Design a protein around this ligand. Structure first.
Ligand code: FMN
Length: 433
């Protein structure tokens, strides 16, 4: 009955609300300060958030006007630092807050990734999640010196095998009680319980064994974000949590239902997939207070930064278009006009008092079948602070949000006490014996 809430973040300056770094209250320039991250983690745990959800890119937004220069000037996801580096400090200052890290299957080898995720699963005591992504920004393929550039759908096939490899390492290589720490017999780990995985496929050849001992979750909680038909299929097959695009009930409900249907052919119980929507919240004690914040942020909204983001995200360079050309069924003039507005993004914008925000959140949950939200920021830390001070108590009083954390791993916070490892109906469960 309780709504899962994640804080949506990225280790860079301009993430989603382009132009806002200028706002006098903002702290985006602190992205280089370790203290920003630990203070954030502490704030989010105070607000009982499920997790900090970190986006990432290793590509550059160089589509709009055929150059990275707009992205560079407007700080559109450049500079960007590595999100995995943040985790240990944030985990150190928190007890329950979990961490979902975006990391691409397209560039770096799974054997190194598997050890990194196992390491965080140990260090965080089972509070790590992985947002599995394929990446769509061409400068990454150039900079990792990829010889054969993979097509959109083929990137997801590579991701399938990438996950196959990680699942074998995480679930199958070392048996549950491999580590015995037996001083009498001088056996730290029973060598008969550590196994090669002997993986052999189209993209990878990985004899194994894994380098790490079994950690609390073994496999990190698996997120997916990617709305293409291939992406939704990938979600249905692998994801425990799905970050969906869409800003209304009809759209979100369609996608929730679509993914749950797709999951059946893989033998998955669709209730074993949680559905997350994006939401931007601008809240005040009174409507006028909310509107005052809205009007302030609107002043700083940078159309040019958004054009750069749109270019990288869609592949469409709009500078190359007459006002009067057509991309969907929308003129290019109308695409651009929607983009200079705060609610033009593919997330719900909720503006008003806490009763209203909560009402609108509750509506999406109850009518679209969504399980949680990734909270998108307009200002740091103001959006999160206002959400925590004003919306959280309203949600709590209504039974819609935890008053305090459940114990256990992040998977248990999501799926129930005792569900610390992937359920029997997940495909990774195949590799246990
Ligand atoms: C809600 C949402 C969030 C996303 N977050 C990221 C991200 O943080 N990093 C990234 O490279 N792609 C992100 N993407 C895009 C995809 O994860 C992926 O990179 C791919 O290029 C697009 O997938 P699709 O074509 O299957 O939709 C996101 C997509 C959606 C819908």
């Amino acid at each position: 009955k309780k709504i899962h809430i994640n804080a949506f973040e990225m280790n860079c300056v301009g993430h989603i609300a382009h132009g806002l770094w200028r706002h006098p209250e903002n702290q985006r320039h602190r992205y280089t300060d370790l203290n920003y991250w630990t203070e954030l983690a502490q704030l989010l745990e105070k607000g009982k958030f499920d997790a900090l959800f970190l986006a990432d890119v290793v590509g550059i937004y160089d589509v709009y006007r055929q150059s990275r220069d707009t992205a560079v000037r407007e700080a559109v996801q450049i500079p960007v630092n590595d999100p995995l580096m943040l985790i240990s400090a944030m985990a150190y200052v928190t007890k329950h807050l979990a961490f979902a890290v975006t990391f691409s299957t397209t560039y770096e080898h799974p054997y190194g990734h598997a050890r990194r995720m196992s390491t965080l699963d140990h260090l965080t005591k089972g509070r790590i999640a992985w947002n599995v992504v394929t990446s769509h920004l061409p400068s990454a393929d150039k900079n990792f010196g990829i010889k054969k550039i993979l097509e959109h759908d083929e990137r997801y096939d590579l991701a399938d095998e990438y996950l196959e490899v990680c699942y074998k390492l995480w679930e199958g290589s070392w048996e549950d009680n491999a580590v015995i720490r037996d001083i009498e017999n001088n056996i730290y780990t029973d060598p008969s319980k550590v196994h090669e995985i002997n993986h052999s496929g189209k993209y990878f050849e990985v004899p194994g064994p894994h380098l790490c001992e079994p950690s609390p979750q073994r496999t990190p909680v698996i997120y997916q974000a990617g709305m293409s038909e291939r992406g939704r299929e990938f979600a249905a097959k692998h994801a425990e949590c799905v970050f969906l695009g869409g800003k209304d009930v009809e759209t979100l409900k369609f996608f929730v239902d679509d993914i749950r249907k797709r999951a059946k052919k893989y033998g998955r119980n669709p209730d074993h997939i949680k559905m997350f929507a994006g939401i931007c919240v601008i809240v005040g004690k009174t409507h006028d207070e909310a509107m005052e914040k809205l009007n302030s942020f609107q002043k700083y909204w940078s159309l040019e930064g958004h054009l750069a983001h749109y270019g990288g995200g869609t592949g469409y360079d709009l500078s190359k278009y007459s006002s009067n050309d057509y991309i969907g069924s929308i003129s290019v003039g109308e695409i651009i006009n929607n983009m200079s507005k705060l609610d033009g993004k593919w997330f719900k914008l909720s503006v008003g008092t806490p009763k209203k925000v909560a009402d609108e959140m509750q509506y999406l949950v109850e009518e679209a079948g969504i399980d949680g939200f990734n909270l998108v920021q307009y200002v740091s830390p103001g959006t999160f602070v206002d959400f925590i001070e004003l919306v959280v108590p309203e949600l709590q009083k209504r039974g819609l949000y935890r008053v305090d954390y459940e114990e256990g791993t992040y998977r248990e916070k999501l799926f129930g006490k005792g569900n610390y490892r992937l359920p029997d109906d997940h495909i990774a469960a195949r590799y246990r014996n």
